[PDB]
Protein backbone atom coordinates (compact mmCIF):
# COMPACT_ATOMS: atom_id res chain seq x y z
CA UNK A 1 0.00 0.00 0.00
CA UNK A 2 2.92 2.31 -0.80
CA UNK A 3 1.62 3.38 -4.21
CA UNK A 4 -1.97 3.70 -3.02
CA UNK A 5 -0.95 6.03 -0.20
CA UNK A 6 0.44 8.40 -2.83
CA UNK A 7 -2.63 8.22 -5.09
CA UNK A 8 -5.25 8.73 -2.37
CA UNK A 9 -3.13 11.68 -1.24
CA UNK A 10 -2.79 13.35 -4.64
CA UNK A 11 -6.52 13.03 -5.27
CA UNK A 12 -7.42 14.40 -1.84
CA UNK A 13 -4.97 17.32 -2.03
CA UNK A 14 -5.88 18.40 -5.57
CA UNK A 15 -9.64 18.15 -4.99
CA UNK A 16 -9.24 20.11 -1.74
CA UNK A 17 -7.10 22.86 -3.27
CA UNK A 18 -9.14 23.06 -6.45
CA UNK A 19 -12.56 23.12 -4.79
CA UNK A 20 -11.26 25.77 -2.39
CA UNK A 21 -10.32 27.88 -5.42
CA UNK A 22 -13.61 27.41 -7.27
CA UNK A 23 -15.64 28.27 -4.17
CA UNK A 24 -13.53 31.38 -3.58
CA UNK A 25 -13.53 32.63 -7.18
CA UNK A 26 -17.34 32.77 -7.12
CA UNK A 27 -17.42 34.24 -3.61
CA UNK A 28 -15.14 37.20 -4.37
CA UNK A 29 -14.56 38.64 -7.87
CA UNK A 30 -15.99 42.05 -6.71
CA UNK A 31 -15.40 44.27 -9.76
CA UNK A 32 -12.10 46.15 -9.58
CA UNK A 33 -10.99 45.73 -5.92
CA UNK A 34 -8.65 42.74 -6.25
CA UNK A 35 -5.95 41.44 -3.89
CA UNK A 36 -8.72 40.54 -1.44
CA UNK A 37 -8.47 36.81 -0.64
CA UNK A 38 -6.96 34.84 -3.51
CA UNK A 39 -3.91 32.75 -2.65
CA UNK A 40 -4.91 30.03 -5.12
CA UNK A 41 -6.45 32.26 -7.80
CA UNK A 42 -3.30 34.42 -7.93
CA UNK A 43 -0.82 31.82 -9.31
CA UNK A 44 -3.31 31.10 -12.09
CA UNK A 45 -2.87 34.42 -13.90
CA UNK A 46 0.88 33.76 -14.08
CA UNK A 47 0.16 31.25 -16.85
CA UNK A 48 -3.43 31.71 -18.04
CA UNK A 49 -5.79 34.32 -16.63
CA UNK A 50 -6.46 37.35 -18.83
CA UNK A 51 -4.23 40.41 -18.47
CA UNK A 52 -3.96 43.26 -15.95
CA UNK A 53 -7.56 43.71 -14.86
CA UNK A 54 -10.56 41.32 -15.04
CA UNK A 55 -11.54 40.35 -18.58
CA UNK A 56 -15.29 40.06 -18.08
CA UNK A 57 -17.44 37.17 -16.87
CA UNK A 58 -18.49 34.91 -19.77
CA UNK A 59 -15.33 34.52 -21.85
CA UNK A 60 -13.05 35.48 -18.94
CA UNK A 61 -14.31 32.81 -16.54
CA UNK A 62 -13.51 30.17 -19.17
CA UNK A 63 -9.74 29.60 -18.68
CA UNK A 64 -10.02 30.15 -14.92
CA UNK A 65 -13.24 28.50 -13.72
CA UNK A 66 -13.41 25.72 -16.32
CA UNK A 67 -9.69 24.98 -16.04
CA UNK A 68 -9.96 24.47 -12.29
CA UNK A 69 -13.20 22.49 -12.60
CA UNK A 70 -11.56 20.22 -15.18
CA UNK A 71 -8.55 19.77 -12.90
CA UNK A 72 -10.61 18.78 -9.85
CA UNK A 73 -13.06 16.64 -11.82
CA UNK A 74 -10.12 14.80 -13.38
CA UNK A 75 -8.19 14.48 -10.12
CA UNK A 76 -11.07 13.26 -7.94
CA UNK A 77 -12.02 10.92 -10.79
CA UNK A 78 -8.58 9.31 -10.71
CA UNK A 79 -8.46 9.39 -6.92
CA UNK A 80 -11.89 7.81 -6.45
CA UNK A 81 -10.94 4.77 -8.51
CA UNK A 82 -7.29 4.85 -7.50
CA UNK A 83 -7.99 4.38 -3.78
CA UNK A 84 -8.80 0.74 -4.54
CA UNK A 85 -5.17 -0.21 -3.89
CA UNK A 86 -5.57 0.71 -0.21
CA UNK A 87 -8.71 -1.36 0.39
CA UNK A 88 -8.36 -4.57 -1.63
CA UNK A 89 -6.15 -6.45 -4.09
CA UNK A 90 -2.67 -7.92 -3.38
CA UNK A 91 -0.58 -6.29 -0.64
CA UNK A 92 2.54 -4.83 -2.30
CA UNK A 93 3.89 -5.57 -5.78
CA UNK A 94 7.07 -5.43 -7.85
CA UNK A 95 6.43 -6.48 -11.47
CA UNK A 96 8.95 -5.71 -14.23
CA UNK A 97 9.73 -2.84 -4.65
CA UNK A 98 11.74 -4.95 -2.20
CA UNK A 99 14.14 -2.34 -0.79
CA UNK A 100 16.73 -3.41 -3.38
CA UNK A 101 19.43 -0.95 -4.47
CA UNK A 102 19.62 -2.41 -7.98
CA UNK A 103 15.85 -2.19 -8.46
CA UNK A 104 15.56 1.21 -6.76
CA UNK A 105 17.75 2.81 -9.43
CA UNK A 106 15.49 1.85 -12.34
CA UNK A 107 12.39 2.56 -10.24
CA UNK A 108 10.92 5.94 -9.38
CA UNK A 109 11.17 7.07 -12.99
CA UNK A 110 9.38 10.34 -12.26
CA UNK A 111 12.20 12.53 -13.55
CA UNK A 112 11.08 12.11 -17.16
CA UNK A 113 7.49 12.65 -16.00
CA UNK A 114 8.15 15.77 -13.92
CA UNK A 115 10.69 17.14 -16.38
CA UNK A 116 8.37 16.80 -19.37
CA UNK A 117 5.59 18.10 -17.13
CA UNK A 118 7.33 21.24 -15.88
CA UNK A 119 8.98 22.20 -19.18
CA UNK A 120 5.81 21.48 -21.16
CA UNK A 121 3.68 23.54 -18.77
CA UNK A 122 6.07 26.51 -18.80
CA UNK A 123 6.80 26.53 -22.54
CA UNK A 124 3.04 26.34 -23.13
CA UNK A 125 3.00 30.12 -22.69
CA UNK A 126 4.88 30.77 -25.94
CA UNK A 127 2.12 28.74 -27.64
CA UNK A 128 -0.90 30.22 -25.85
CA UNK A 129 -0.56 33.24 -23.58
CA UNK A 130 2.74 34.41 -22.14
CA UNK A 131 2.01 35.25 -18.50
CA UNK A 132 1.71 38.90 -17.43
CA UNK A 133 4.72 40.98 -16.34
CA UNK A 134 7.49 43.34 -17.49
CA UNK A 135 5.32 45.36 -19.90
CA UNK A 136 1.75 45.97 -18.68
CA UNK A 137 -0.48 43.38 -20.43
CA UNK A 138 0.58 40.01 -21.84
CA UNK A 139 2.57 38.65 -24.76
CA UNK A 140 5.30 36.05 -24.49
CA UNK A 141 8.05 35.91 -27.11
CA UNK A 142 11.78 35.40 -27.78
CA UNK A 143 14.09 33.23 -25.65
CA UNK A 144 16.75 34.38 -23.18
CA UNK A 145 19.12 31.41 -22.95
CA UNK A 146 23.78 27.58 -16.71
CA UNK A 147 22.87 31.13 -17.75
CA UNK A 148 22.16 32.72 -14.33
CA UNK A 149 24.14 32.42 -11.09
CA UNK A 150 25.33 29.04 -9.86
CA UNK A 151 24.41 29.70 -6.24
CA UNK A 152 21.01 29.96 -4.55
CA UNK A 153 19.24 32.68 -6.50
CA UNK A 154 15.50 32.73 -5.83
CA UNK A 155 15.11 36.32 -7.05
CA UNK A 156 16.00 35.43 -10.64
CA UNK A 157 12.82 37.09 -11.93
CA UNK A 158 14.66 40.38 -12.47
CA UNK A 159 14.58 42.78 -15.44
CA UNK A 160 14.07 40.09 -18.08
CA UNK A 161 11.22 37.89 -16.85
CA UNK A 162 11.60 35.67 -19.93
CA UNK A 163 14.66 34.01 -18.36
CA UNK A 164 12.32 32.11 -16.02
CA UNK A 165 10.66 30.07 -18.78
CA UNK A 166 13.93 29.40 -20.58
CA UNK A 167 15.47 28.09 -17.38
CA UNK A 168 12.99 25.21 -17.39
CA UNK A 169 13.54 24.06 -20.98
CA UNK A 170 17.30 23.63 -20.51
CA UNK A 171 17.48 22.31 -16.94
CA UNK A 172 14.38 20.21 -17.57
CA UNK A 173 15.26 18.39 -20.79
CA UNK A 174 18.73 17.73 -19.36
CA UNK A 175 17.27 16.31 -16.14
CA UNK A 176 14.65 14.10 -17.81
CA UNK A 177 17.03 12.67 -20.41
CA UNK A 178 19.84 12.40 -17.87
CA UNK A 179 17.61 10.80 -15.26
CA UNK A 180 16.19 8.00 -17.40
CA UNK A 181 19.74 7.25 -18.58
CA UNK A 182 21.15 7.04 -15.04
CA UNK A 183 18.97 3.98 -14.36
CA UNK A 184 31.65 2.92 -5.99
CA UNK A 185 28.33 1.72 -4.58
CA UNK A 186 29.15 3.19 -1.16
CA UNK A 187 27.08 6.39 -1.12
CA UNK A 188 25.11 6.40 2.14
CA UNK A 189 22.46 3.87 3.18
CA UNK A 190 20.11 3.44 0.22
CA UNK A 191 16.59 2.78 1.53
CA UNK A 192 12.93 3.77 1.44
CA UNK A 193 13.22 6.17 4.37
CA UNK A 194 16.53 7.72 3.30
CA UNK A 195 15.05 8.57 -0.10
CA UNK A 196 11.93 10.01 1.53
CA UNK A 197 13.87 12.30 3.89
CA UNK A 198 16.11 13.63 1.12
CA UNK A 199 13.04 14.18 -1.07
CA UNK A 200 11.33 16.20 1.67
CA UNK A 201 14.47 18.07 2.68
CA UNK A 202 14.97 19.25 -0.89
CA UNK A 203 11.28 20.09 -1.37
CA UNK A 204 11.17 22.07 1.88
CA UNK A 205 14.31 23.96 0.86
CA UNK A 206 12.35 25.22 -2.15
CA UNK A 207 9.31 25.99 0.01
CA UNK A 208 11.05 28.25 2.52
CA UNK A 209 12.78 29.96 -0.41
CA UNK A 210 9.62 30.40 -2.49
CA UNK A 211 7.93 31.80 0.62
CA UNK A 212 10.07 34.88 -0.01
CA UNK A 213 10.70 34.72 -3.76
CA UNK A 214 6.95 34.89 -4.35
CA UNK A 215 6.76 38.08 -2.28
CA UNK A 216 9.77 40.11 -3.45
CA UNK A 217 10.86 40.07 -7.10
CA UNK A 218 7.88 39.97 -9.47
CA UNK A 219 6.05 36.64 -8.97
CA UNK A 220 2.68 38.36 -8.49
CA UNK A 221 1.84 41.96 -9.37
CA UNK A 222 -1.45 42.20 -7.45
CA UNK A 223 0.37 41.23 -4.23
CA UNK A 224 2.34 43.65 -2.03
CA UNK A 225 5.85 43.39 -0.56
CA UNK A 226 8.22 44.60 2.17
CA UNK A 227 9.87 46.79 -0.48
CA UNK A 228 6.46 47.99 -1.70
CA UNK A 229 5.21 49.14 1.71
CA UNK A 230 8.42 51.11 2.30
CA UNK A 231 9.61 52.40 -1.08
CA UNK A 232 6.15 53.37 -2.34
CA UNK A 233 5.27 54.75 1.11
CA UNK A 234 8.30 57.03 0.79
CA UNK A 235 7.23 57.97 -2.74
CA UNK A 236 3.78 58.91 -1.42
CA UNK A 237 5.21 61.08 1.36
CA UNK A 238 7.67 62.84 -0.96
CA UNK A 239 5.19 63.40 -3.80
CA UNK A 240 2.66 64.90 -1.38
CA UNK A 241 5.32 67.14 0.17
CA UNK A 242 6.88 68.33 -3.09
CA UNK A 243 3.44 69.36 -4.36
CA UNK A 244 3.41 71.98 -1.60
CA UNK A 245 7.04 73.16 -1.75
CA UNK A 246 9.57 70.90 -3.55
CA UNK A 247 13.40 70.78 -3.57
CA UNK A 248 14.47 67.61 -1.75
CA UNK A 249 17.72 68.44 0.06
CA UNK A 250 17.64 69.22 3.79
CA UNK A 251 18.23 67.69 7.24
CA UNK A 252 15.72 66.57 9.88
CA UNK A 253 17.75 64.14 12.02
CA UNK A 254 20.61 62.43 10.18
CA UNK A 255 20.50 63.09 6.43
CA UNK A 256 17.78 61.92 4.02
CA UNK A 257 14.90 63.86 5.64
CA UNK A 258 12.66 64.05 2.57
CA UNK A 259 14.17 61.38 0.31
CA UNK A 260 17.47 59.85 -0.88
CA UNK A 261 20.26 59.40 1.68
CA UNK A 262 22.85 57.74 -0.59
CA UNK A 263 24.50 54.84 1.25
CA UNK A 264 26.52 51.65 0.67
CA UNK A 265 27.40 52.01 -3.02
CA UNK A 266 24.42 53.67 -4.74
CA UNK A 267 22.98 57.19 -4.99
CA UNK A 268 19.43 55.98 -4.24
CA UNK A 269 18.20 59.20 -5.87
CA UNK A 270 16.85 57.37 -8.94
CA UNK A 271 17.70 60.28 -11.26
CA UNK A 272 17.07 63.80 -9.93
CA UNK A 273 15.68 64.66 -13.37
CA UNK A 274 12.62 62.43 -12.91
CA UNK A 275 11.89 63.93 -9.48
CA UNK A 276 11.70 67.64 -10.33
CA UNK A 277 9.86 67.54 -13.67
CA UNK A 278 8.52 63.99 -13.23
CA UNK A 279 6.60 61.83 -15.69
CA UNK A 280 3.98 60.13 -13.50
CA UNK A 281 0.41 61.14 -12.68
CA UNK A 282 -1.81 58.07 -13.02
CA UNK A 283 0.93 55.56 -12.20
CA UNK A 284 2.01 57.39 -9.04
CA UNK A 285 -1.47 57.64 -7.52
CA UNK A 286 -2.03 53.93 -8.14
CA UNK A 287 1.16 52.78 -6.40
CA UNK A 288 0.31 54.80 -3.28
CA UNK A 289 -2.89 52.76 -2.91
CA UNK A 290 -1.05 49.52 -2.10
CA UNK A 291 1.44 51.01 0.37
CA UNK A 292 -1.44 52.38 2.46
CA UNK A 293 -2.57 48.81 3.20
CA UNK A 294 0.79 47.34 4.28
CA UNK A 295 1.97 43.80 3.53
CA UNK A 296 3.42 42.48 6.80
CA UNK A 297 0.21 42.81 8.83
CA UNK A 298 -2.66 45.17 8.00
CA UNK A 299 -4.99 44.25 10.87
CA UNK A 300 -8.44 55.42 20.37
CA UNK A 301 -5.46 55.10 18.04
CA UNK A 302 -4.97 54.63 14.32
CA UNK A 303 -4.98 51.35 12.39
CA UNK A 304 -1.88 49.22 11.75
CA UNK A 305 0.45 46.80 13.57
CA UNK A 306 -1.05 48.00 16.86
CA UNK A 307 -4.77 48.70 17.40
CA UNK A 308 -6.88 48.67 14.23
CA UNK A 309 -10.56 48.77 13.23
CA UNK A 310 -11.71 48.33 9.63
CA UNK A 311 -9.57 46.70 6.94
CA UNK A 312 -9.47 43.59 4.73
CA UNK A 313 -6.55 41.10 4.67
CA UNK A 314 -2.85 40.78 3.79
CA UNK A 315 -1.58 39.38 0.43
CA UNK A 316 1.36 36.95 0.43
CA UNK A 317 1.64 37.20 4.23
CA UNK A 318 -0.75 34.24 4.58
CA UNK A 319 1.43 32.00 2.41
CA UNK A 320 4.64 33.08 4.15
CA UNK A 321 3.19 32.08 7.53
CA UNK A 322 1.11 28.98 6.79
CA UNK A 323 3.05 27.22 4.04
CA UNK A 324 6.42 28.40 5.36
CA UNK A 325 5.49 27.21 8.85
CA UNK A 326 4.41 23.85 7.42
CA UNK A 327 7.63 23.56 5.41
CA UNK A 328 9.91 24.25 8.38
CA UNK A 329 7.99 21.78 10.55
CA UNK A 330 8.02 18.97 7.99
CA UNK A 331 11.73 19.50 7.32
CA UNK A 332 12.50 19.24 11.04
CA UNK A 333 10.61 15.96 11.17
CA UNK A 334 12.18 14.63 7.97
CA UNK A 335 15.83 15.31 8.82
CA UNK A 336 15.24 13.79 12.26
CA UNK A 337 13.60 10.78 10.62
CA UNK A 338 16.71 10.25 8.49
CA UNK A 339 18.60 9.30 11.65
CA UNK A 340 16.11 6.48 12.27
CA UNK A 341 17.13 4.80 9.01
CA UNK A 342 20.89 5.10 9.51
CA UNK A 343 20.60 3.67 13.03
CA UNK A 344 18.13 0.88 12.25
CA UNK A 345 20.33 -1.61 10.41
CA UNK A 346 23.35 -0.71 12.56
CA UNK A 347 21.58 -0.13 15.87
CA UNK A 348 17.83 -0.75 16.21
CA UNK A 349 15.61 0.51 19.04
Amino acid sequence: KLLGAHVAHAGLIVFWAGAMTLFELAHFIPEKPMYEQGLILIPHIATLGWGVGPGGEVVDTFPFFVVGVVHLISSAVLGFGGVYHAIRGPETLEEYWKDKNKMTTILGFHLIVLGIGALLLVAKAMFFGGLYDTWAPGGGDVRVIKSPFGGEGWIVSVNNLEDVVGGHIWIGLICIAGGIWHIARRAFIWSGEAYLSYSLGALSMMGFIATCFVWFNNTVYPXXXXXXXXXXXXXXXXXXXXXXXXXXXXXXXXXXXXXXXXXXXXXXXXXXXXXXXXXXXXXXXXXXXXXXXXXXXXXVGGVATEINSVNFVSPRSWLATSHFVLAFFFLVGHLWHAGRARAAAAGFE
Binding site: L12, F15, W16, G18, A19, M20, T21, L22, F23, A26
Partner: peptide, 27 residues
Amino acid sequence: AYAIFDPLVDVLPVIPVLFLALAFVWQ
Protein backbone atom coordinates in the same frame (compact mmCIF):
# COMPACT_ATOMS: atom_id res chain seq x y z
CA ALA B 1 -28.34 27.50 -6.69
CA TYR B 2 -25.37 25.22 -5.89
CA ALA B 3 -23.69 27.86 -3.72
CA ILE B 4 -22.34 25.21 -1.34
CA PHE B 5 -19.21 24.72 -3.46
CA ASP B 6 -16.97 26.47 -0.92
CA PRO B 7 -18.17 24.11 1.88
CA LEU B 8 -17.13 20.98 -0.03
CA VAL B 9 -13.62 22.13 -0.98
CA ASP B 10 -12.27 22.97 2.48
CA VAL B 11 -13.93 20.01 4.23
CA LEU B 12 -12.35 17.72 1.61
CA PRO B 13 -9.08 17.85 3.63
CA VAL B 14 -10.33 19.16 6.97
CA ILE B 15 -12.49 16.20 7.99
CA PRO B 16 -10.62 13.25 6.36
CA VAL B 17 -7.73 11.82 8.40
CA LEU B 18 -8.89 14.04 11.26
CA PHE B 19 -12.16 12.30 12.19
CA LEU B 20 -12.13 9.35 9.78
CA ALA B 21 -8.79 7.91 10.93
CA LEU B 22 -8.11 9.49 14.33
CA ALA B 23 -11.19 8.03 16.02
CA PHE B 24 -11.39 4.86 13.91
CA VAL B 25 -7.65 4.14 14.18
CA TRP B 26 -7.66 1.77 11.18
CA GLN B 27 -4.57 2.61 9.08
